[PDB]
PDB file of C-alpha atoms and ligand atoms in Angstrom:
ATOM      1  CA  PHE W   1      -0.129   0.073   0.147  1.00  0.00           C
ATOM      2  CA  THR W   2       1.632   3.205  -0.993  1.00  0.00           C
ATOM      3  CA  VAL W   3       0.389   6.855  -0.637  1.00  0.00           C
ATOM      4  CA  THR W   4       2.107   8.871  -4.002  1.00  0.00           C
ATOM      5  CA  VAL W   5       1.872  12.782  -4.021  1.00  0.00           C
ATOM      6  CA  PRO W   6       2.671  14.212  -7.722  1.00  0.00           C
ATOM      7  CA  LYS W   7       3.493  17.203  -6.297  1.00  0.00           C
ATOM      8  CA  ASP W   8       5.515  17.511  -3.108  1.00  0.00           C
ATOM      9  CA  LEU W   9       6.620  21.606  -3.180  1.00  0.00           C
ATOM     10  CA  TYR W  10       3.698  23.463  -3.775  1.00  0.00           C
ATOM     11  CA  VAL W  11       5.380  27.861  -4.214  1.00  0.00           C
ATOM     12  CA  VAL W  12       1.920  29.921  -3.674  1.00  0.00           C
ATOM     13  CA  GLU W  13       0.521  33.146  -3.659  1.00  0.00           C
ATOM     14  CA  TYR W  14      -1.255  35.080  -0.637  1.00  0.00           C
ATOM     15  CA  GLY W  15      -4.324  35.148  -1.568  1.00  0.00           C
ATOM     16  CA  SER W  16      -4.585  32.051  -3.882  1.00  0.00           C
ATOM     17  CA  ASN W  17      -6.637  28.910  -3.199  1.00  0.00           C
ATOM     18  CA  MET W  18      -4.577  25.648  -3.587  1.00  0.00           C
ATOM     19  CA  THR W  19      -5.102  21.823  -4.262  1.00  0.00           C
ATOM     20  CA  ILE W  20      -2.501  18.972  -3.093  1.00  0.00           C
ATOM     21  CA  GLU W  21      -3.549  16.210  -4.373  1.00  0.00           C
ATOM     22  CA  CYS W  22      -2.993  13.100  -2.437  1.00  0.00           C
ATOM     23  CA  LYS W  23      -3.384   9.673  -4.404  1.00  0.00           C
ATOM     24  CA  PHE W  24      -3.933   6.089  -2.691  1.00  0.00           C
ATOM     25  CA  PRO W  25      -5.156   2.648  -5.074  1.00  0.00           C
ATOM     26  CA  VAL W  26      -8.480   2.153  -5.663  1.00  0.00           C
ATOM     27  CA  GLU W  27      -8.317  -1.665  -7.154  1.00  0.00           C
ATOM     28  CA  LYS W  28     -12.085  -1.917  -6.823  1.00  0.00           C
ATOM     29  CA  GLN W  29     -15.362   0.236  -5.982  1.00  0.00           C
ATOM     30  CA  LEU W  30     -14.498   2.199  -2.899  1.00  0.00           C
ATOM     31  CA  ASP W  31     -15.170   0.550   0.399  1.00  0.00           C
ATOM     32  CA  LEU W  32     -15.825   3.656   2.545  1.00  0.00           C
ATOM     33  CA  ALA W  33     -16.309   1.856   6.135  1.00  0.00           C
ATOM     34  CA  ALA W  34     -12.401   0.856   5.404  1.00  0.00           C
ATOM     35  CA  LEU W  35     -11.040   4.587   4.287  1.00  0.00           C
ATOM     36  CA  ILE W  36      -9.689   6.780   6.329  1.00  0.00           C
ATOM     37  CA  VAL W  37      -8.282  10.494   5.548  1.00  0.00           C
ATOM     38  CA  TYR W  38      -6.378  12.647   7.708  1.00  0.00           C
ATOM     39  CA  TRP W  39      -4.432  15.923   6.986  1.00  0.00           C
ATOM     40  CA  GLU W  40      -2.388  18.048   8.807  1.00  0.00           C
ATOM     41  CA  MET W  41      -0.054  20.890   8.972  1.00  0.00           C
ATOM     42  CA  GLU W  42       2.499  20.961  12.094  1.00  0.00           C
ATOM     43  CA  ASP W  43      -0.016  19.853  14.651  1.00  0.00           C
ATOM     44  CA  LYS W  44      -3.087  21.293  12.994  1.00  0.00           C
ATOM     45  CA  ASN W  45      -6.074  19.192  12.102  1.00  0.00           C
ATOM     46  CA  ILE W  46      -7.024  19.869   8.811  1.00  0.00           C
ATOM     47  CA  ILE W  47      -9.208  16.412   7.890  1.00  0.00           C
ATOM     48  CA  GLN W  48     -10.200  14.190   9.897  1.00  0.00           C
ATOM     49  CA  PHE W  49     -12.713  11.890   7.229  1.00  0.00           C
ATOM     50  CA  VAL W  50     -12.939   8.480   9.177  1.00  0.00           C
ATOM     51  CA  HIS W  51     -15.626   6.024   7.305  1.00  0.00           C
ATOM     52  CA  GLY W  52     -17.583   8.278   5.658  1.00  0.00           C
ATOM     53  CA  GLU W  53     -18.021  11.125   7.980  1.00  0.00           C
ATOM     54  CA  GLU W  54     -16.425  13.893   9.183  1.00  0.00           C
ATOM     55  CA  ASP W  55     -15.871  16.045  12.793  1.00  0.00           C
ATOM     56  CA  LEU W  56     -16.128  19.625  12.025  1.00  0.00           C
ATOM     57  CA  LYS W  57     -15.323  20.035  16.461  1.00  0.00           C
ATOM     58  CA  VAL W  58     -11.853  18.269  15.329  1.00  0.00           C
ATOM     59  CA  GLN W  59     -10.493  20.679  12.739  1.00  0.00           C
ATOM     60  CA  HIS W  60      -8.281  23.062  13.851  1.00  0.00           C
ATOM     61  CA  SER W  61     -10.080  26.481  13.933  1.00  0.00           C
ATOM     62  CA  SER W  62      -7.341  28.495  11.869  1.00  0.00           C
ATOM     63  CA  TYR W  63      -8.852  26.009   9.029  1.00  0.00           C
ATOM     64  CA  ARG W  64     -12.530  26.317   9.746  1.00  0.00           C
ATOM     65  CA  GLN W  65     -14.136  27.727   6.832  1.00  0.00           C
ATOM     66  CA  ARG W  66     -10.983  27.566   4.804  1.00  0.00           C
ATOM     67  CA  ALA W  67     -10.337  23.697   4.079  1.00  0.00           C
ATOM     68  CA  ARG W  68     -11.859  20.886   2.685  1.00  0.00           C
ATOM     69  CA  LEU W  69     -11.493  17.021   1.510  1.00  0.00           C
ATOM     70  CA  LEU W  70     -12.750  17.100  -2.623  1.00  0.00           C
ATOM     71  CA  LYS W  71     -14.683  14.080  -1.714  1.00  0.00           C
ATOM     72  CA  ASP W  72     -16.058  13.552  -5.463  1.00  0.00           C
ATOM     73  CA  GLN W  73     -12.420  12.702  -5.682  1.00  0.00           C
ATOM     74  CA  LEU W  74     -11.995   9.918  -3.154  1.00  0.00           C
ATOM     75  CA  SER W  75     -13.662   7.075  -5.593  1.00  0.00           C
ATOM     76  CA  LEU W  76     -10.669   7.387  -7.766  1.00  0.00           C
ATOM     77  CA  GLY W  77      -8.356   7.403  -5.254  1.00  0.00           C
ATOM     78  CA  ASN W  78      -7.488  11.499  -4.834  1.00  0.00           C
ATOM     79  CA  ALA W  79      -7.546  12.495  -1.296  1.00  0.00           C
ATOM     80  CA  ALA W  80      -6.892  15.937  -2.546  1.00  0.00           C
ATOM     81  CA  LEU W  81      -7.153  19.098  -0.343  1.00  0.00           C
ATOM     82  CA  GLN W  82      -8.440  22.160  -0.908  1.00  0.00           C
ATOM     83  CA  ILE W  83      -7.242  25.220   0.998  1.00  0.00           C
ATOM     84  CA  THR W  84      -8.852  29.176   0.330  1.00  0.00           C
ATOM     85  CA  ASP W  85      -7.034  32.341   0.326  1.00  0.00           C
ATOM     86  CA  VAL W  86      -3.788  30.882   1.551  1.00  0.00           C
ATOM     87  CA  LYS W  87      -2.083  33.291   4.368  1.00  0.00           C
ATOM     88  CA  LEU W  88       1.377  33.540   5.495  1.00  0.00           C
ATOM     89  CA  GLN W  89       0.147  31.252   8.379  1.00  0.00           C
ATOM     90  CA  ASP W  90      -0.295  28.433   5.589  1.00  0.00           C
ATOM     91  CA  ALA W  91       3.111  27.684   4.882  1.00  0.00           C
ATOM     92  CA  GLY W  92       4.805  24.629   6.111  1.00  0.00           C
ATOM     93  CA  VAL W  93       5.293  21.444   6.100  1.00  0.00           C
ATOM     94  CA  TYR W  94       1.445  18.876   5.004  1.00  0.00           C
ATOM     95  CA  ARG W  95       1.012  15.491   5.903  1.00  0.00           C
ATOM     96  CA  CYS W  96      -1.840  13.532   4.322  1.00  0.00           C
ATOM     97  CA  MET W  97      -2.592   9.986   5.211  1.00  0.00           C
ATOM     98  CA  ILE W  98      -4.480   7.407   4.326  1.00  0.00           C
ATOM     99  CA  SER W  99      -5.338   4.045   5.868  1.00  0.00           C
ATOM    100  CA  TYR W 100      -7.186   2.155   3.462  1.00  0.00           C
ATOM    101  CA  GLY W 101      -6.315  -1.924   3.475  1.00  0.00           C
ATOM    102  CA  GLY W 102      -2.943  -1.139   4.597  1.00  0.00           C
ATOM    103  CA  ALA W 103      -1.496   3.120   5.777  1.00  0.00           C
ATOM    104  CA  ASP W 104       1.109   5.026   4.480  1.00  0.00           C
ATOM    105  CA  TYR W 105       1.425   9.179   4.348  1.00  0.00           C
ATOM    106  CA  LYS W 106       2.725  11.739   2.175  1.00  0.00           C
ATOM    107  CA  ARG W 107       4.624  15.164   2.977  1.00  0.00           C
ATOM    108  CA  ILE W 108       4.387  18.263   0.727  1.00  0.00           C
ATOM    109  CA  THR W 109       6.050  21.544   1.858  1.00  0.00           C
ATOM    110  CA  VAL W 110       4.088  24.163   0.985  1.00  0.00           C
ATOM    111  CA  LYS W 111       6.056  28.181   0.682  1.00  0.00           C
ATOM    112  CA  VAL W 112       3.566  31.200   0.729  1.00  0.00           C
ATOM    113  CA  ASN W 113       5.224  34.012  -1.013  1.00  0.00           C
ATOM    114  CA  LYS W 114       3.709  37.204  -0.469  1.00  0.00           C
TER     115      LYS W 114
ATOM    116  CA  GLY C   1      17.547   6.392   8.420  1.00  0.00           C
ATOM    117  CA  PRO C   2      14.959   8.336   6.798  1.00  0.00           C
ATOM    118  CA  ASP C   3      12.843   5.012   5.864  1.00  0.00           C
ATOM    119  CA  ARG C   4      12.452   4.595   9.581  1.00  0.00           C
ATOM    120  CA  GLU C   5      12.164   8.432  10.586  1.00  0.00           C
ATOM    121  CA  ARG C   6       9.454   8.014   8.026  1.00  0.00           C
ATOM    122  CA  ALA C   7       8.211   5.262  10.173  1.00  0.00           C
ATOM    123  CA  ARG C   8       8.132   6.814  13.166  1.00  0.00           C
ATOM    124  CA  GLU C   9       6.493   9.856  11.571  1.00  0.00           C
ATOM    125  CA  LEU C  10       3.584   7.411  10.464  1.00  0.00           C
ATOM    126  CA  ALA C  11       2.911   6.121  13.752  1.00  0.00           C
ATOM    127  CA  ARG C  12       2.762   9.722  15.685  1.00  0.00           C
ATOM    128  CA  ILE C  13      -0.177  10.171  12.624  1.00  0.00           C
ATOM    129  CA  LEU C  14      -1.541   7.227  13.740  1.00  0.00           C
ATOM    130  CA  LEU C  15      -1.833   7.857  17.016  1.00  0.00           C
ATOM    131  CA  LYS C  16      -3.564  11.137  16.508  1.00  0.00           C
ATOM    132  CA  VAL C  17      -6.479   9.860  14.631  1.00  0.00           C
ATOM    133  CA  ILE C  18      -6.351   7.335  17.168  1.00  0.00           C
ATOM    134  CA  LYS C  19      -7.086   9.418  20.453  1.00  0.00           C
ATOM    135  CA  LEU C  20      -8.884  11.328  18.465  1.00  0.00           C
ATOM    136  CA  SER C  21     -11.375   9.179  16.606  1.00  0.00           C
ATOM    137  CA  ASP C  22     -15.337   8.340  18.356  1.00  0.00           C
ATOM    138  CA  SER C  23     -15.175   4.492  16.113  1.00  0.00           C
ATOM    139  CA  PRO C  24     -14.066   1.544  17.860  1.00  0.00           C
ATOM    140  CA  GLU C  25     -13.244   0.203  14.634  1.00  0.00           C
ATOM    141  CA  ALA C  26     -11.298   2.662  12.961  1.00  0.00           C
ATOM    142  CA  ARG C  27      -9.365   2.584  16.196  1.00  0.00           C
ATOM    143  CA  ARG C  28      -8.740  -1.090  15.904  1.00  0.00           C
ATOM    144  CA  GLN C  29      -7.634   0.048  11.887  1.00  0.00           C
ATOM    145  CA  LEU C  30      -5.036   2.347  12.911  1.00  0.00           C
ATOM    146  CA  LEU C  31      -3.780  -0.153  15.332  1.00  0.00           C
ATOM    147  CA  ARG C  32      -3.549  -2.653  12.662  1.00  0.00           C
ATOM    148  CA  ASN C  33      -1.811  -0.244  11.185  1.00  0.00           C
ATOM    149  CA  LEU C  34       0.808   0.414  13.943  1.00  0.00           C
ATOM    150  CA  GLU C  35       1.208  -3.783  14.396  1.00  0.00           C
ATOM    151  CA  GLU C  36       2.043  -3.519  10.780  1.00  0.00           C
ATOM    152  CA  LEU C  37       4.630  -0.629  11.392  1.00  0.00           C
ATOM    153  CA  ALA C  38       6.321  -2.349  14.418  1.00  0.00           C
ATOM    154  CA  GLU C  39       6.364  -6.321  12.511  1.00  0.00           C
ATOM    155  CA  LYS C  40       8.360  -4.449   9.488  1.00  0.00           C
ATOM    156  CA  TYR C  41      10.724  -1.932  10.865  1.00  0.00           C
ATOM    157  CA  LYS C  42      11.219  -3.494  14.745  1.00  0.00           C
ATOM    158  CA  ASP C  43      11.518  -0.278  16.139  1.00  0.00           C
ATOM    159  CA  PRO C  44      11.726   0.412  19.727  1.00  0.00           C
ATOM    160  CA  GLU C  45      10.336   3.978  19.094  1.00  0.00           C
ATOM    161  CA  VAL C  46       7.107   2.583  17.127  1.00  0.00           C
ATOM    162  CA  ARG C  47       6.768   0.622  19.653  1.00  0.00           C
ATOM    163  CA  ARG C  48       6.093   2.933  22.562  1.00  0.00           C
ATOM    164  CA  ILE C  49       3.632   4.084  20.032  1.00  0.00           C
ATOM    165  CA  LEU C  50       1.836   0.835  19.673  1.00  0.00           C
ATOM    166  CA  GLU C  51       2.197   0.628  23.544  1.00  0.00           C
ATOM    167  CA  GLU C  52       0.201   4.399  24.210  1.00  0.00           C
ATOM    168  CA  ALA C  53      -2.358   3.050  21.541  1.00  0.00           C
ATOM    169  CA  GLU C  54      -3.263   0.059  22.633  1.00  0.00           C
ATOM    170  CA  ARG C  55      -4.349   1.837  25.979  1.00  0.00           C
ATOM    171  CA  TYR C  56      -7.346   3.828  23.792  1.00  0.00           C
ATOM    172  CA  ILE C  57      -8.449   0.587  21.888  1.00  0.00           C
ATOM    173  CA  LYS C  58     -11.290   0.702  25.203  1.00  0.00           C
TER     174      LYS C  58
HETATM  175 BR1  LIG Q 201       7.204  11.872   2.585  1.00  0.00          BR
END
């Protein structure tokens, strides 16, 4: 079981939206009761998608109303994180962890320019 | 080296989700991932993370 990222280094502008792709193998129909998707940066919980459901109370405040998992993509094996209106505090190392018949994770480094 | 450091980092993530999860099934699934990591890397840091995680499998 391998998680792969097509782009592990982002250089984004202040005020941009950014989409970070995080891919995992799906050789069947997606079995939602076996899937966990987790996104963080530093120790900030961004996305915690557990077996088809999310807990809004777990998401860090600085990502409330600004970060979302593109759930349409999950059936294709892409657990893409979308972040709206990027600011300097969003620079850093993002981590995407997938557990789906095995576990893996990737790091994505995000520089914010302005 | 770096692969071991990645395994330790993944293990820490698995523990975090366990602590913040409601679902016994999710917790068991992540614990399985941890034992899979312990089985592969035979690492004392992964082991201690696994030991702490086992305390949350209620
Ligand atoms: Br990585």
